[PDB]
Amino acid sequence: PVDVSVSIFINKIYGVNTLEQTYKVDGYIVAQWTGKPRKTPGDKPLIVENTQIERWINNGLWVPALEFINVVGSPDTGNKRLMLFPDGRVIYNARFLGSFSNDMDFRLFPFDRQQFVLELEPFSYNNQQLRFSDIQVYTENIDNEEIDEWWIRGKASTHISDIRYDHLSSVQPNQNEFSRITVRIDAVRNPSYYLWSFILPLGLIIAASWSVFWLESFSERLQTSFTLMLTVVAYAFYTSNILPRLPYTTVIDQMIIAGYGSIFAAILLIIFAHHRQANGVEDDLLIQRCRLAFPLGFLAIGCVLVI
Amino acid sequence: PVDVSVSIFINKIYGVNTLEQTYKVDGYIVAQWTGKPRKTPGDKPLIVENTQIERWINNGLWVPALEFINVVGSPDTGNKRLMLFPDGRVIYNARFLGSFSNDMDFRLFPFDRQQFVLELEPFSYNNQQLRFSDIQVYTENIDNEEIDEWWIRGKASTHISDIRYDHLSSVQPNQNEFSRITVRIDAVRNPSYYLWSFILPLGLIIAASWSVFWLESFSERLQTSFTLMLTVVAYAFYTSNILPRLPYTTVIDQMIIAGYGSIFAAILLIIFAHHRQANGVEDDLLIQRCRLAFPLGFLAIGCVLVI
Amino acid sequence: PVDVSVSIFINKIYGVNTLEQTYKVDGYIVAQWTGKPRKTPGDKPLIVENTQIERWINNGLWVPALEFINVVGSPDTGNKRLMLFPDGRVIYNARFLGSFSNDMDFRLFPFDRQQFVLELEPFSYNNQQLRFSDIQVYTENIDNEEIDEWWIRGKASTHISDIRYDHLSSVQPNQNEFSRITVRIDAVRNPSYYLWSFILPLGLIIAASWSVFWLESFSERLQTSFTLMLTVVAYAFYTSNILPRLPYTTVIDQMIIAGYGSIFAAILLIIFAHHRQANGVEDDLLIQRCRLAFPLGFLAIGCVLVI
Amino acid sequence: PVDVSVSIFINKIYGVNTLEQTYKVDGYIVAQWTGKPRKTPGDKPLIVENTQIERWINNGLWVPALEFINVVGSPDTGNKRLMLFPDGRVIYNARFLGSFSNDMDFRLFPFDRQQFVLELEPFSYNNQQLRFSDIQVYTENIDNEEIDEWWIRGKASTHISDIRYDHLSSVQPNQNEFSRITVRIDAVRNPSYYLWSFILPLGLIIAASWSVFWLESFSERLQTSFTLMLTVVAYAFYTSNILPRLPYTTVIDQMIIAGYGSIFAAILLIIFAHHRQANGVEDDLLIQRCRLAFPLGFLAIGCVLVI
Amino acid sequence: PVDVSVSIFINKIYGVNTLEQTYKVDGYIVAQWTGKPRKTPGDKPLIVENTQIERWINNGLWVPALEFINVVGSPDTGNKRLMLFPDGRVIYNARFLGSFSNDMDFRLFPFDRQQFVLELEPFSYNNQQLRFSDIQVYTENIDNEEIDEWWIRGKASTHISDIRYDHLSSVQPNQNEFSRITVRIDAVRNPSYYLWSFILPLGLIIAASWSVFWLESFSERLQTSFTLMLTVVAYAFYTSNILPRLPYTTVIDQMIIAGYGSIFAAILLIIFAHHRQANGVEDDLLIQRCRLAFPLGFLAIGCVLVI
């Protein structure tokens, strides 16, 4: 086997998206290995630019085709470069940019934790083993934590493993080990935007839904509650482009469900606190009579769902 | 004829879209056949990477152009390689990433069942017969049932058919039958999102629509209804984002059709219950007592009849 | 001149779009002409795949560059193939997938009827005359009854014509005849979706906007109307994404205009029936104080027009 | 220098975009110059198709690289063609499609008079002088008056000018003057769509804003106005996808501003006419009663503007 | 080392986007250096067009690969050119068009002062030192200030720095310093659109929220605020498409927060001014018969939000 020492320089992780759980990454790969010695012009290293590499691959040079595993589509490779040394070693350097994909857990949506993963791997050769993955992070999200949405903690985490591909039993089935380099960068979502756009107004609407008790005419109270129905409906589309069709409810979907349920219970407890009267007046039947401790007693039932 | 054994490795089926009934598929293809023997450098199998293949086809190598039938556009092939063995056989291996299209049936929308189909076929040859398909699928199945909207049941299903093409009747009669490989993957939609976003709130709005019958002031029994009209109009648009323009009503669209009438009929059961008399300028007295059966107790029949 | 016999196999006409009047088409072209005899390996028709064609064109083979006229952006050709026969004839076969553009007439929108047009033509040669077109259309959408939005009635109609190009008077003004193949496929829109989403709710709002006559409190008969003016405007956006910026009014636009007019006329008849200088009388038993004659008398104000 | 007479056949101008001031153009270019005589096969003109040009440029043929100045991105060139004559002249013909960009002025929006500009220019040579420009435009003009949004008036205007380029002052002083070919087509927007979608309903809301003065119950004359506030807010969004966020106000923006101001004044002249004292000991409650002169006196407050 | 003088001609900066902080730039690059003398045909500068460069690189010409650092993807290069002089120097000229990326600070959103940055840098050579960057910008500065959203004031400032790359210790660690050219252009947003679309109407809504105090029926003083809630929610989505998910609140976000808080405080003040009677039932006329003395304290705090 031949030894290949990779070096990944990350330039900027941008374009994050939660509807598809993707993120665009840009950077440089620098792979380096050792082959047979050679005679170069003069006695210096020989640099070979974008299209001059094909003429060297045609004549018999060995250059592996390193690919990214968790990529959507195919990366948009910029320039390329080879640097043939006279002592024997070779250094393939190339710029990459691609939309990678990972798995995200939005069970606690606004206060979220993810990790961006890059999985590099040879495409054709089973016996060429990556020795040591090094990563250099030059991203701007670490030191500008007030403009970005995703803070980046730590530095990185790199692991060199072996993958077993069983679909490659065409080749002798005992020769399908593929070395792989996984690189993880942990990120923390900055929740300070969803706190005054989906938690404060929805909380205010919820707390202002029990105040309809403080009225003299139920004929006005039903319309009062059906007015807040429209606001709670309005805050249901505003949260329809923030996160995907998830089967589990998040901190905001729970607030929307509670906003529906609180108003529905207001209706159901303002109807049955009147439709079993004994006199014939509007505000009676032990809930609408006093209106000094009951309009504040139903307030703590929602706090159970909050707590 | 020559015999070509195919093996398809599916990596991730993502980007499903019911608006156009498409889905993006990523994976690898490994076709393997047998030709004439040859002398290779040393005695090992000779591997030929991305752009070195085009120099072997020029010299006289036989490599078929396999295509996908049900693709939208043209797949974005990644790397590719040949593996020429000295005993004679050849192994063409190549990564693909396409945007395939199937037919979907949303007559029962949220509790849906589909199947993702892939169809390989030679483009130019009729006498080259694919022996057998072997799909190696490891897209997540049991842990995929909490994040992804679809669940992958079973393992797979592969068949090998013989299509007869009529537009190629210019050539000899027997020479217009191409073999084809079809691969089906059954999937079940996770309906747990449309149960607290389009059925729970609509189900409450439906039942909170005849509550206006439990009122006294006809001067407001129309405003309390025209507010729910606007609520149902609000939910009407929030559904046009999900589904295509289907001529048959789904399980959700019906809850919208029953959202106008159940409200609309309300007026038609209020108005005709308001002027049952020919004397008096004020409301109708004798009708305000039997409201429990005809005005409101009939939508209970509307709920137990169709459901 | 040389005689070319095109044959077009249509696979699926998808992605129709009325905002730009485009439609994507996928299929195969099979052109076939006769040249001079030649010696092929063995005595078989020699097949030439994707990239081997550009090498046969170098040595002096004649292959015309057929183009599509009414295409939006150059198409996305998939595989290509030549079939050089020993007796002399040549068969150029190639897959195409492109987004074509036709003209549409939405003067009667929901019950529409269009035709998809494909125009093929040589790009460089004036003296090479397409002889006989042949459409092979086993499309997946004529077997439709309630699946897709467009039914297909007949599936084929072809015509071979000539064209005079004036910008090509650089050559002698006689050498600018360009034979062209036109292929028309008549399609009929499935109106069963716009009947219970734009004709039913608007049709009910129209008749529910004149019901405000059955009231007595003019202090509230103007507010109960402005909650309906808020409904008709809600369907004015729901229509702005299913049609282009058309000068002529469709059926749905006519319905929305009639809704605006009906609500405005209701307001004006309410105001004039109360107090003004055009009548002078104060609160007669006009449209407000009557519940039988006039609230059913304005039913022919909208039912006078024919469409 | 060498004289190159360019002809331009305009096939269709579509995809106009008010939000970005772009428009896609599809057409042909036919440049033609004279060089040195040559011997061609036979005695006929020699036609050279798409990829055979790049081999004639290798041997020493002179073909200029004509670029488009005001293009967004790079155009999508379709087929190409050369026609080498034996007498010496050469005719380079090529199909083009590109998203061009001009400057537009929406100070009077619906009745626009924008114009479409195409700017062709050599990229490398200053001494090659475009000598004569013909445009051959047969895009739909007088039948375009009912389906397309823009009418074409006159269809053609061309001019050949010279740009002095300062960034090329590294070369000799006289050798940075590049000729051009400018092509201007006169378009006129068809305003018949914005007259019954943004002017009729907005005007009806304007006229229905003072109608609240025909009331007595001040306790509801604020709700009857806060409903029209919501109506004007609804129409405020329906305009935000037509105009490119212009600093100057168009007609519709002026109408929205008037819709805010009219209702705000209606509020401010209701509140200060409610507690307006008669003499200082009893509130004047007779200004609101007179509903003949006062409600009409507000109609001319908006009709003072002459736009 | 090789001394390379760079000139950059900027043609138009369009497509600015603040939701992701990009901007598309189009222009020309002219790099010029000195090599070894040579004999050219005749005695003139030899011009080499797009596809003829890749041949001169084959024979041994030295052309550097200059990349852009802060680009999203890879620029869409148009034409290229080489101008080989006989005295020795070479002039590589090429058109570029790419979507760049800078950092923007919306802490004071409408009155923005963002700036546009371009960064050239060699990709492969460290001993290839750019001498002196000149920039030629004719992006309009005085006449454009009424049509486009971003004024461009002053000249563009250019700086040649040296970056040290740590990930390039593969090559001898004392030769990893690459020169870089940075070009900054000063932009200033034209805040004449957000003044009559997000500050004027929001200001009128905020100033019309305290006006509910001048009312008599508290049974209706609670519905007015719940109607204003809907308008304040309507002005909350209209802002969610002009800004990114920013943690710091802008001016418009502060206005939305103040609009929520003003109506919430109005509710909490009016409900307590009602509860002052030691109940919430039996509305009395004491608050209106003293509306000129007592409730002025409820508005006196409402004008503290301003100062």
PDB file of N, CA and C in Angstrom, chain D residues 82 173 179 301:
ATOM      1  N   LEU D  82     -19.309  28.017 -39.758  1.00  0.00           N
ATOM      2  CA  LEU D  82     -18.504  28.847 -40.639  1.00  0.00           C
ATOM      3  C   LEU D  82     -18.822  28.476 -42.078  1.00  0.00           C
ATOM      4  N   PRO D 173      -1.081  54.380 -27.047  1.00  0.00           N
ATOM      5  CA  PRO D 173      -2.207  55.275 -26.732  1.00  0.00           C
ATOM      6  C   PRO D 173      -3.357  55.209 -27.717  1.00  0.00           C
ATOM      7  N   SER D 179     -14.811  49.491 -31.444  1.00  0.00           N
ATOM      8  CA  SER D 179     -16.092  49.783 -32.066  1.00  0.00           C
ATOM      9  C   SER D 179     -17.203  48.982 -31.391  1.00  0.00           C
ATOM     10  N   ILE D 301     -61.097  66.297  -0.389  1.00  0.00           N
ATOM     11  CA  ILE D 301     -59.818  66.391   0.308  1.00  0.00           C
ATOM     12  C   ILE D 301     -58.756  65.569  -0.411  1.00  0.00           C
TER      13      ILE D 301
END
